[PDB]
């Protein structure tokens, strides 16, 4: 590689990144005419801080995202309700889910439509299951992303993982409850055993930070945020940047950037032979076939056919170099799925892996595909 | 070191993957002794058409549908192979034979009326001249006399004995690295090719002694849109078969390697050579191969072969032969059902000091830019590897799909599925492939009735894995779990 | 297990090597001695300031330190001033303040005191180095131009941002190649007046755009100047684009961080860290990872986790070094900081996965000399060896082992003083000096291990160049 | 093809890395032919135990000794046990007999019978105590297969599965059954306590070893002043196929008797017992011989058969150490071209050895230093190219520790030790040099008068050491 490679300077390959992108809401980015924005420039994600407002601030947030979503109806925001939870002033030194979180869930987070809850401060396992108990028939299409912000939940994040959905990292607060010369080690063991298990992790705090005021980052911001990339990271979040900061959609749009240039230095073929190092199932087994099948026949794109999104989330696991398209009929799969590094969707009523070759400019004609259900198929655009 | 003395039992050596040719003739005529040739691993039937005519190997071949009414599940393939060119001498004075002194000279004429003595004999091959220069050596009577070419002229050649020898009447020569100018494929043979192959359901033609990629261009040619179910598997017999072998493999369906008559061709130190390059380079494109003559002579008059006889055929299943070939122990020899039990409990010796994880890496470094078909083939073995399924099935209307598996050398059986009787019987020559007839056909249910009838044929039991394999341009990789 | 605080015996075996850039905040004796314990390897001079009396003084301080710290063997480095662009002095010395979109005036007439609408440069060639569209930053890059205009003693800007500027403020032309001496006549004075006399081990020089540059600081060395090794720092697109035949020509590299981040998009200078480090670790050639390390604690006595984040993965990419500048130099915990340095490198060191490293290697690059020391890195392992020896005279042989990053410490044994120096740089290695035979010379050398890093029976490759490998018991 | 088809010079097939051991006996008795067997490739010298007596065998030791005065070359000498033998007795008129396919035989323990048809003797006087019925006997080589059907005290009835002639006093193999006599008896015992030791013989062939007792007999036999001798036990019967790794273990190195393996197992099974027992030799690093049925056609044909040198080719690749001549030589008409043609064989089925598959197969128990060493010189030779690799040894560990990982570069070894020199006759890969007893600088002062090595690299190593030189 010459270096001249490295400084060259494109709106359709960097919009092309695998690393999804969760943007807080706020007085900032709140409008439609923002969201919309905000989606061209790679917004995946929308997260709900119920730190902040209440039920009838949220509620048209939420009905200007589906507003967004009517101006670009090839877009599918998954919806994230951050509590509020238990939350030295630079504040640190109660119920993990008290009955204003609780309210929050059953009385907004179901009837709402929101995706995903991220619960702040968890502690223990003890944690994930009463939420997913308070969830029960009504909340099945939620999933539970806890988040590690403390050293209890550092302590317990094995049973914490074994019980969650994915994971959110908070450094942060992390640092203001372990030495930060230890951080990164946390960050990157986490991350790591989330890898291991194909559970999303979002890597959350101290991104870009200084871009609240500046169209710009700095090198040490963009430099921290390209190494959670390398991390293995599924998603990286913005906080203040999008809700309160002067330039929410450049902002967006140099993460993008950020992840595009990380992904660059990702050594494809290694991170498939390491995965498999780290006794399997057929659909474990299937989806290692297709990953090793499309680098082989040179794949344009890996078609994940799935209900549940287990078949796009077990090959987006191995992180291969070609884009995957999920094509799902369930509509919340779809939404759980944009959460997913290296995966997007497609939503879908055998008609569907031809119907869908035809919408994807995401193919040359002759290219091949891999196509996976117990099976594999391997095609040519026609 | 004890594993090793145990004795297999019927169940473990009918098991193995390595396929048998057997040739016909009057020892193994009778259909009950043909029934019992199939049951001890016969997969191939030779009609070797160097004797014989159209109406006793028509006779042969009812004899052989005959022995499958017997055996419904068995699909034996037929292969014709040809007599091409031969070169003998011609007769001695009163029909006795003459012995040669060495360092005598000896006059061979071209004129085949000449009835010879101990200075003059005739050869049937009236171009001899024109083939054989000075300083060339000319093998007699299996190689048993050895003279070396002096002089020629134009119907003459004036040789040295090089050794001493007793030889008869009409026996066979042999000229080593001197090309045979006669036609491959003569008149009589493009008789047996069209008037019998052709009409009497013949699968394979083996040529003998063919020497250019324009002798097996020939013989597609003569077979045309009638003879296109056909498959052509040339015998490598001599040098210029060996020196243009790139060539005619390019061109061929499979080939045949004539271990006894190379050794009569290039010294006897080089033959093992030719035989694992052949071999390897068949391996590498997935066209079948079988290893010939020579194989366990001693067996057409001993109920047991030798030590020596047991290890050449065993080294020629670890060289990655598709095939083993029985010649005069099936067609003439005291004990042709015992000598297919002995070579099918030996390809299962052998097949036990197969390394089949070793085997599918030295083969995808082999091959190259791949193609999805060999791609997905290549995957479907790793897969059944990962997920321990019992069997491999290769749904499959050319063969290719069967072919391409069985290339990369799976511990599991390949069971190929075909709508197609020419490609059920073209697979019989195909290491490591069962077959089993369907008709045309969507995938789904195919795999579903193969799975009832492989359970009843004790291949799989439930709950087992199974992985599953259709291609052509769609491509498929199935993983289930039989009921 | 991460939660768990690590020993100093731990921490201080750290790998990574450690350049301090020395200033009045460590210019006692005694703050330097403490360095020395914390983990500092090599002693930056930054020949930007000072002169020589001055810079004499802090190398006799140096020679002082040594002196109650036998064991240390300090590599000395100056650092070249090399080409500066600056602005011009302002109306009373008042700072000015820019207006976003307001038409800024940069003249090349040094002699023009400035005002909100024109200011000066000290870059003559100005004009003809910039284009219009061409950015110029300004004081650390708090102001950002654009050229909209271009003449032949100014160009004419519009201010991208706004903000307020002081006199005499540094300048970057991103993009833009400066043609300015890297090397000047006050470069050549220090190089030549006090590198050599003085007794410098390396030359970092500032501000490298070609091999030209280097092949030139080599030529000037002479055979003067030939135990000194030089050491290009990368700072811009043009040391960047000729960055291949730059360490052809070097002996290491430097890596300037917060100085290319003024010159390229921030998000690419993750990139060209990573490539760089990786092309020096591929030819052996020591790296150092410097600017923006721990800058917080010039002020604080704990960093910042991105800051521990930052460092940690510089030891990843595979850095042999990693250096402090201000923390050292001009703040208030120099000693503290190292000490934090040396720990955050400990620990990021215990995330390398060594036999990858020697694999990924093997693939990547065969000498006889390379041979024996990649066949000594793998006996080692192979062996449950302890330590390896070097026996070296020029350091390479010790060098090549290094490369190969092996889990064992490596001794490298040298009669030669400044091989010793020199290899203060190289990531793994610690340096023993020696006058003796190839096998006297292992004796003792086991002796003195055993005195520190091998218990009774453990295995120990030896490597000795000239090509040897010996694999001996301690008894 | 045309690689494979040309014809290989004298200088490459003299170049074989497999070692050649030769039977002594009348056609190659004499220095001059003996002479030209050694640079036909001759490595070791087989004396045959069962024939000849000790002043006979003494004259064939004399003649190698005036023979490598000619060829100043360092030839082996082994001493090959006699060991027990199983034989029929004398027959009715000194008549052979035939016996008819379903007759009965009975087998006797009174060796002073004279046999009919109906029954004939049998010397092993223990044979109705080890044969049960449902046994196979085999007699002449296998010419007849008889059937075990009763035993009594002094006598064994059987029934022929074959119609065969057999003569006189021949020999008999019993399939699956121990031969119940002492492997070294007072004969063996005599042949090696005054005829091994004091005639200079390197290696004891023992025929016929059955029990890994066997060996630490000989060992103890041998004691102080046969401490220089090294024993190579035959494995010829089940019961040594059943011991084999117990008397690999306290062996030096190995013969195979496929020969007479094939009368004791079936012989689908021999070729698999040849394999693993070779593969368990070259994982330990001792050598192994290959011995009986190699190039038999070539006793009266100056030609040996397409069948025979391939089973000899499959030797060389299966990995045997070395490959052995019996009657080809003892006896028979060309015992010089035997050699060549052996040679040959030998060098062309060294082609198709893949050799960084062999180091990386014997790479794949934690190891010790010197053989760590040796790993790192093939490792290190292949990488720098070397043109030969010098191996320091005195008890010769070293030089079989390197040839075990079978290194694509010959191997000089170099000792003081003049036993260890000629121990070292039968490792592939190996040729040897006598040194006075640094060493190497004079090591490569003959290596290029020798054609073997300027400005090639060497790797030389000690046993721990190991050095890369550039040969000026």
Same mark, same amino acid.
């Given at each position: 590689?010459?270096?001249?490679?490295?400084?060259?300077?494109?709106?359709?390959?960097?919009?092309?990144? $695998?690393?999804?992108?969760?943007?807080?809401?706020?007085?900032?980015?709140?409008?439609?005419?923002?969201?919309?924005?905000?989606?061209?420039?790679?917004?995946?994600?929308?997260?709900?801080?119920?730190?902040?407002?209440?039920?009838?601030?949220?509620?048209?947030?939420?009905?200007?995202?589906?507003?967004? =979503?009517?101006? $670009?109806?090839?877009?599918?925001?998954?919806? @994230?309700?951050?509590?509020?939870?238990?939350?030295?002033?630079?504040?640190?030194?109660?119920?993990?889910?008290?009955?204003?979180?609780?309210?929050?869930?059953?009385?907004? &987070?179901?009837?709402?439509?929101?995706?995903?809850?991220?619960?702040?401060?968890?502690?223990?396992?003890?944690?994930?299951?009463?939420?997913?108990? @308070?969830?029960? +028939?009504?909340?099945?299409?939620?999933?539970?992303?806890?988040?590690?912000?403390?050293?209890?939940?550092?302590?317990?994040?094995?049973?914490?993982?074994?019980?969650?959905?994915?994971?959110?990292?908070? $450094?942060?607060?992390?640092? =203001?409850?372990?030495?930060?010369?230890?951080?990164?080690?946390?960050?990157?063991?986490?991350?790591?055993?989330?890898?291991?298990?194909?559970?999303?992790?979002?890597?959350?705090?101290?991104?870009?930070?200084?871009?609240?005021?500046?169209? $710009?980052?700095?090198?040490?911001?963009?430099?921290?945020?390209?190494?959670?990339?390398?991390?293995?990271?599924?998603?990286?979040?913005?906080?203040?940047?999008?809700?309160?900061?002067?330039?929410?959609?450049?902002?967006?749009?140099?993460?993008?950037?950020?992840?595009?240039?990380?992904?660059?230095?990702?050594?494809? +073929?290694?991170?498939?032979?390491? =995965?498999?190092?780290?006794?399997?199932?057929?659909?474990?087994?299937?989806?290692?076939?297709?990953?090793?099948?499309?680098?082989?026949?040179?794949?344009?794109?890996?078609?994940?056919?799935?209900?549940?999104?287990?078949?796009?989330?077990? *090959?987006?696991?191995?992180?291969?170099?070609?884009?995957?398209?999920?094509?799902?009929?369930?509509?919340?799969?779809?939404?759980?799925?944009?959460?997913?590094?290296?995966?997007?969707?497609?939503?879908?009523?055998?008609?569907? *892996?031809?119907?869908?070759?035809?919408?994807?400019?995401?193919?040359?004609? &002759?290219?091949?595909?891999?196509?996976?259900?117990?099976?594999?198929?391997?095609?040519?655009?026609?």
């Amino acid at each position: 590689i010459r270096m001249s490679q490295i400084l060259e300077p494109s709106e359709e390959d960097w919009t092309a990144h $695998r690393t999804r992108i969760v943007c807080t809401m706020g007085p900032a980015c709140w409008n439609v005419d923002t969201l919309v924005k905000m989606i061209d420039a790679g917004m995946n994600v929308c997260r709900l801080n119920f730190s902040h407002g209440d039920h009838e601030t949220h509620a048209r947030t939420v009905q200007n995202i589906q507003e967004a =979503m009517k101006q $670009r109806p090839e877009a599918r925001l998954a919806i @994230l309700l951050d509590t509020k939870g238990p939350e030295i002033l630079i504040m640190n030194l109660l119920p993990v889910i008290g009955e204003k979180d609780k309210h929050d869930i059953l009385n907004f &987070g179901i009837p709402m439509g929101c995706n995903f809850i991220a619960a702040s401060f968890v502690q223990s396992a003890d944690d994930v299951r009463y939420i997913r108990g @308070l969830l029960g +028939p009504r909340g099945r299409h939620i999933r539970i992303i806890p988040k590690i912000e403390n050293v209890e939940g550092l302590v317990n994040f094995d049973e914490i993982l074994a019980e969650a959905d994915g994971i959110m990292i908070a $450094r942060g607060d992390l640092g =203001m409850e372990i030495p930060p010369e230890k951080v990164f080690l946390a960050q990157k063991m986490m991350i790591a055993k989330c890898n291991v298990v194909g559970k999303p992790v979002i890597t959350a705090t101290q991104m870009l930070e200084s871009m609240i005021k500046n169209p $710009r980052p700095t090198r040490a911001e963009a430099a921290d945020v390209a190494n959670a990339v390398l991390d293995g990271t599924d998603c990286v979040m913005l906080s203040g940047e999008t809700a309160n900061g002067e330039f929410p959609v450049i902002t967006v749009e140099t993460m993008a950037r950020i992840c595009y240039e990380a992904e660059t230095c990702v050594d494809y +073929p290694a991170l498939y032979r390491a =995965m498999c190092l780290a006794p399997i199932s057929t659909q474990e087994a299937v989806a290692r076939a297709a990953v090793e099948t499309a680098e082989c026949v040179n794949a344009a794109i890996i078609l994940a056919l799935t209900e549940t999104g287990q078949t796009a989330r077990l *090959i987006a696991k191995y992180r291969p170099m070609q884009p995957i398209l999920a094509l799902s009929a369930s509509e919340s799969t779809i939404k759980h799925l944009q959460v997913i590094r290296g995966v997007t969707t497609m939503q879908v009523p055998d008609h569907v *892996i031809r119907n869908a070759i035809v919408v994807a400019e995401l193919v040359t004609e &002759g290219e091949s595909i891999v196509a996976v259900h117990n099976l594999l198929k391997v095609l040519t655009v026609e």
